[PDB]
Each structure stands twice: as C-alpha cells, then as structure tokens.
Amino acid sequence: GETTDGVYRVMTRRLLGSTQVGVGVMQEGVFHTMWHVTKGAALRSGEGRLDPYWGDVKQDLVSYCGPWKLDAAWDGLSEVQLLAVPPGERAKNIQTLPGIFKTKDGDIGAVALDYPAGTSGSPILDKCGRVIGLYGNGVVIKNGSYVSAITQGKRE
C-alpha cells in the first residue's frame, strides 16, 4: 500500500478502540520494527498486505516486505535524537546523549528516556538523519524509569 519512506504507527483493532502497539520505520520498501510489537504477524497498509521476511527474538527485530536496510551506527560520542511517536500524541524529536549497556558480548548504546510501552519501535537518529537503531527493548532501573538499548539490525 503506502510505501512512502518515513516513520509509521503500528495499530490494532483487536482491543477496545484503536490501540497503538508500537512504531516502525519504512525505508527502501521495507518496514523495520521491534519483534514484541507484531510478534511476526502480517500487517496491513491501507489495503496492502505486509508479510514478514526476517526476524530474531534475541535481537528483538523484524523486517517486512524485505531484508533489513537500516545500517547506521552510533559513533559513541555524539548526541542523538529519538523520533518519539507516543500513543495518541504527535511525533517529537527528543535530543539526548546516550549512556552505555555493558554486556558479555560487547557494549551497546543506551537512551535514558521515559516513554510508554506503545512507543516501541521509534527510530534513534543521528545528526545526518540516519536511523542508528530502535527504542523499545531495555531494562527497568532502580528509580522505576526505563533505559532502552540502541537496537540495530544487519544489512547485506
């Protein structure tokens, strides 16, 4: 259906009213989102049928209509922007400086911004505009707040 490059909302009519389960990124005929948002279920754009192509539960990523296209990477020093698309509210660019997630398989970027679970799949942007990752999977901190990883997929 609508394959215009941009950021999109992931809605469902299964619950009371229309409920925003997440956000996604349409780039190069492929819709990239977080896995827990759709759970690999076929989406719909207008009348068009968007079918899954690739996915991984550990990475928590899923691509529709084609392989993963987003390949920008955080430099480790520069401030980033979160194109936050909240449920019921307009999209907003929130600039921040990311922290760090220390894991056994290397370190990854982390955005410490407090948002509802329906904002999952919103793009983390760089100063050029490129999508360096997805907001939606992280951990709940000692203060209640949420710190999300900068989740990036793999190009071919």
Binding site: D5, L43, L50, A91, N93, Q95, A112, N137
Partner: protein
C-alpha cells in the same frame, strides 16, 4: 488484524528538546531477547 498509519518524516530537527541522562549499566541478554539488570 494489525495495520500501519504514517506518523511523519525521518529528519534531525535543530533547536529540539535536549533532555535525558547517560547511564553506564551492567546488563545480561537472555534467549527470550529480554535485558536484565545485573549487579
């Protein structure tokens, strides 16, 4: 059935809201793709 609704353009906007901290947190990732606070 789920569906998509366009929400905007992907652009870095200058003079935007600069908020949020930078925390270094020790975490672990599991087979179900969930992060856990390891201390």
């Amino acid at each position: 059935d789920m569906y998509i609704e366009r929400a905007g353009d992907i652009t870095w906007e200058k003079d935007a809201e600069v908020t949020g901290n930078s925390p270094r947190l020790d975490v672990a990732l599991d087979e179900s793709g969930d992060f856990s606070l390891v201390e």
